[PDB]
Scaffold this active site. Sequence first.
Site, short mmCIF file in Angstrom:
data_model
loop_
_atom_site.label_atom_id
_atom_site.label_comp_id
_atom_site.label_asym_id
_atom_site.label_seq_id
_atom_site.Cartn_x
_atom_site.Cartn_y
_atom_site.Cartn_z
N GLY A 8 11.64 26.32 -19.40
CA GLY A 8 10.58 25.31 -19.31
C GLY A 8 10.55 24.60 -17.98
N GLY A 9 9.83 23.48 -17.94
CA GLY A 9 9.69 22.69 -16.75
C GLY A 9 10.95 21.92 -16.38
N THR A 10 11.82 21.61 -17.35
CA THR A 10 13.09 20.88 -17.02
C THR A 10 14.36 21.62 -17.44
OG1 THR A 10 11.86 18.82 -17.37
CG2 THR A 10 14.23 18.60 -17.13
N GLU A 70 4.63 30.71 -25.36
CA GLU A 70 5.56 29.74 -25.91
C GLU A 70 5.07 29.05 -27.20
OE1 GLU A 70 6.32 25.65 -24.25
OE2 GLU A 70 5.53 26.63 -22.46
N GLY A 122 9.39 14.20 -19.47
CA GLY A 122 9.20 14.02 -18.06
C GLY A 122 8.82 12.63 -17.65
N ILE A 124 9.64 9.92 -19.51
CA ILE A 124 10.86 9.18 -19.71
C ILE A 124 11.76 9.20 -18.46
CG2 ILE A 124 12.98 9.05 -21.02
CD1 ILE A 124 11.34 10.02 -23.49
N1 LIG Z 1 20.62 17.54 -20.01
C1 LIG Z 1 19.33 17.16 -19.73
N2 LIG Z 1 18.88 17.04 -18.45
C2 LIG Z 1 17.61 16.67 -18.18
N3 LIG Z 1 16.73 16.37 -19.17
C3 LIG Z 1 17.08 16.43 -20.47
C4 LIG Z 1 18.44 16.84 -20.81
N4 LIG Z 1 18.56 16.82 -22.14
C5 LIG Z 1 17.39 16.44 -22.63
N5 LIG Z 1 16.48 16.18 -21.64
C6 LIG Z 1 15.11 15.73 -21.92
O1 LIG Z 1 14.34 16.78 -22.45
C7 LIG Z 1 13.16 16.95 -21.64
C8 LIG Z 1 12.81 18.41 -21.50
O2 LIG Z 1 12.49 18.89 -22.83
P1 LIG Z 1 12.37 20.43 -23.17
O3 LIG Z 1 11.83 20.62 -24.57
O4 LIG Z 1 13.68 21.07 -22.84
O5 LIG Z 1 11.20 20.78 -22.06
P2 LIG Z 1 10.95 22.06 -21.08
O6 LIG Z 1 10.76 23.30 -21.92
O7 LIG Z 1 9.67 21.67 -20.41
O8 LIG Z 1 12.11 22.10 -20.13
C9 LIG Z 1 13.43 16.28 -20.33
O9 LIG Z 1 12.23 15.83 -19.66
C10 LIG Z 1 14.33 15.16 -20.73
O10 LIG Z 1 13.59 14.04 -21.17
C1 LIG Z 2 -6.21 14.92 -18.23
C2 LIG Z 2 -5.48 14.47 -19.53
C3 LIG Z 2 -4.31 15.39 -19.86
C4 LIG Z 2 -3.93 15.32 -21.33
C5 LIG Z 2 -3.84 16.73 -21.88
N1 LIG Z 2 -2.59 17.41 -21.39
C6 LIG Z 2 -2.04 18.37 -22.10
O1 LIG Z 2 -2.46 18.74 -23.19
C7 LIG Z 2 -0.75 18.97 -21.53
C8 LIG Z 2 0.45 18.28 -22.23
N2 LIG Z 2 1.68 19.05 -21.94
C9 LIG Z 2 1.98 20.18 -22.60
O2 LIG Z 2 1.28 20.68 -23.50
C10 LIG Z 2 3.32 20.83 -22.18
O3 LIG Z 2 3.93 20.07 -21.12
C11 LIG Z 2 3.12 22.34 -21.69
C12 LIG Z 2 2.08 22.40 -20.53
C13 LIG Z 2 2.68 23.23 -22.88
C14 LIG Z 2 4.45 22.90 -21.18
O4 LIG Z 2 5.43 22.81 -22.19
P1 LIG Z 2 6.75 21.96 -21.87
O5 LIG Z 2 7.54 22.88 -20.81
O6 LIG Z 2 7.54 21.91 -23.26
O7 LIG Z 2 6.44 20.63 -21.28
#
Ligand SMILES: Nc1ncnc2c1ncn2[C@@H]1O[C@H](COP(=O)(O)OP(=O)(O)O)[C@@H](O)[C@H]1O
Ligand SMILES: CCCCCNC(=O)CCNC(=O)[C@H](O)C(C)(C)COP(=O)(O)O
EC number: 2.7.1.33
Lengths: 266, 266
Positions: A8-10, A70, A122, A124
């Site tokens: 994912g993104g984080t 996903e 993100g 948070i």
């Molecule tokens: N060890 C960690 N390091 C950084 N962020 C974490 C951690 N554990 C939990 N998080 C939280 O979980 C979020 C990412 O959620 P997640 O469902 O894994 O998203 P993604 O698929 O986008 O990576 C982060 O933005 C943060 O708030």
């Molecule tokens: C201009 C107003 C924007 C509000 C609408 N935005 C959205 O619906 C995107 C919200 N974010 C997501 O659905 C997730 O972050 C997504 C892009 C699926 C990526 O999944 P994740 O890696 O879990 O964050």
Amino acid sequence: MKVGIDAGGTLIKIVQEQDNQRTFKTELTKNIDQVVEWLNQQQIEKLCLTGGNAGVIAENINIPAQIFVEFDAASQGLGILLKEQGHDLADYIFANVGTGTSLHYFDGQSQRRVGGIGTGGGMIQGLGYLLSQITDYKQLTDMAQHGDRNTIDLKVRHIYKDTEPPIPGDLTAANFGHVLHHLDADFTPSNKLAAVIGVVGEVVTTMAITVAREFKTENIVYIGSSFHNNALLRKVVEDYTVLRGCKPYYVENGAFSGAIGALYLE
Amino acid sequence: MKVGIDAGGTLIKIVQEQDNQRTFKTELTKNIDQVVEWLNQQQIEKLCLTGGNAGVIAENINIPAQIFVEFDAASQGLGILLKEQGHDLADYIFANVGTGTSLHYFDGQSQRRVGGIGTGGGMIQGLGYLLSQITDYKQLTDMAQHGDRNTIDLKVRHIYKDTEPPIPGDLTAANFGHVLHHLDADFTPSNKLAAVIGVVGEVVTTMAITVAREFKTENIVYIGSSFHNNALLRKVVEDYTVLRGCKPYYVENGAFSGAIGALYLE
Ligand SMILES: Nc1ncnc2c1ncn2[C@@H]1O[C@H](COP(=O)(O)OP(=O)(O)O)[C@@H](O)[C@H]1O
Ligand SMILES: CCCCCNC(=O)CCNC(=O)[C@H](O)C(C)(C)COP(=O)(O)O
Ligand SMILES: Nc1ncnc2c1ncn2[C@@H]1O[C@H](COP(=O)(O)OP(=O)(O)O)[C@@H](O)[C@H]1O
Ligand SMILES: CCCCCNC(=O)CCNC(=O)[C@H](O)C(C)(C)COP(=O)(O)O
């Protein structure tokens, strides 16, 4: 071994399956090179990827991978986890609180996306950093847990001073709306961080209960790594879901729903 | 004269009717005692009150005054203003972005509250202060119009790296979710404030669009003093409304919907 990954993104969530036993692991998306290096050294029977950075892993590894979307992967894996953990739900909303928030209605047969919002993990981290200068996730979230929101948030009853309000007085009316009335207060990092978690939890829950009403289900299942090391977030969400006449569910390993589902879709 | 008053959490909105002409005045809720003094010195035929601080006024005035629930008052005045301004809408969502945000479905017959959220004007002010130290509303909102959110907000396209995203790549994925990638230098007050207004706008709009789908209307009308001196907020809300296939409306003097409606209800 079979490997499922939700990049994912984080966070990079990794599920290893051998002898009908799963192993769970996480790495930061910032360290995606280490994940690649590790995969290039494994004996793997099946490699299934999902999430935003699936493409990057597949491009950089020396072995074949399968990639899945996903939304379906998360649905499939969550379905597996629910049944493993004793839930027989006919239908539900699931709210995937990742870097951001994606909302889905599962009708018993398949998922459709019904909502999303940028209030998630993100925010948070990012807004927490702006208010506290804390970059380490665990310290940031730990710092929030005993924060007091009273000098920061405005409740309905604060607006309806000496007037019966038309909705519950204890409800948050305005996140951060009490700050200008408490300029003599020390806005401590804990209080400020608790308010951050509060606005995120409230917004996620409000979206989820709204789509639950729309799609005629009382069940709302919350997943995503944003709930890790954040009991306060879990409480904000769980409390307000119940107050809105819905049933909240958390699942063990819910943050790995996508990685597990990637393996099952294959 | 006849006077309608919407005494909210932040602003007291006063409408005076006389010789078939209406006059608008605003005072700070901070200074409600001045409003009460002024009322007690005026020759008023009828006084109609609404909002959380209606009770305060009502208690300290020396004449009778009718009190109305602000949801009905706001709906009535909005309907008047809409019709006065050449909008004949069969049905609509209206989103009242005051100190906090209240969401309503107006089916033609009447309004029902269908949701609410603490992301509104009080958040813009309070979180704005925490991020800029600015207390003056005009200064705060002015500063924000020149801000860029590119370095603070994360889009879907940032998560789906070099890969076609499952939903539109330009959408905000995580508000403030880009902060942790830009830590080398401080974040400017204008950028931070733009991001605050951005998240309030997006949350409000996402909720409005969802309940519009739920109640099968394409029209969403936005009111509240939160839009005063804030072109950025008007824009964020409008663009995402149109993006999701809905029709946004704003009315001139919409912040006075409640005050006008209190008069009409009496
Ligand atoms: N060890 C960690 N390091 C950084 N962020 C974490 C951690 N554990 C939990 N998080 C939280 O979980 C979020 C990412 O959620 P997640 O469902 O894994 O998203 P993604 O698929 O986008 O990576 C982060 O933005 C943060 O708030
Ligand atoms: C201009 C107003 C924007 C509000 C609408 N935005 C959205 O619906 C995107 C919200 N974010 C997501 O659905 C997730 O972050 C997504 C892009 C699926 C990526 O999944 P994740 O890696 O879990 O964050
Ligand atoms: N002069 C001002 N002073 C303070 N806030 C203002 C002013 N003008 C506009 N606002 C904005 O409007 C919001 C309040 O909107 P309003 O609809 O009047 O709510 P309420 O009825 O709760 O007072 C404030 O939170 C702020 O964002
Ligand atoms: C615990 C989760 C709280 C989220 C839900 N909160 C709400 O629905 C209350 C949102 N705020 C409002 O509806 C308004 O601020 C209200 C209390 C009607 C006062 O109107 P205004 O003076 O315009 O802010």
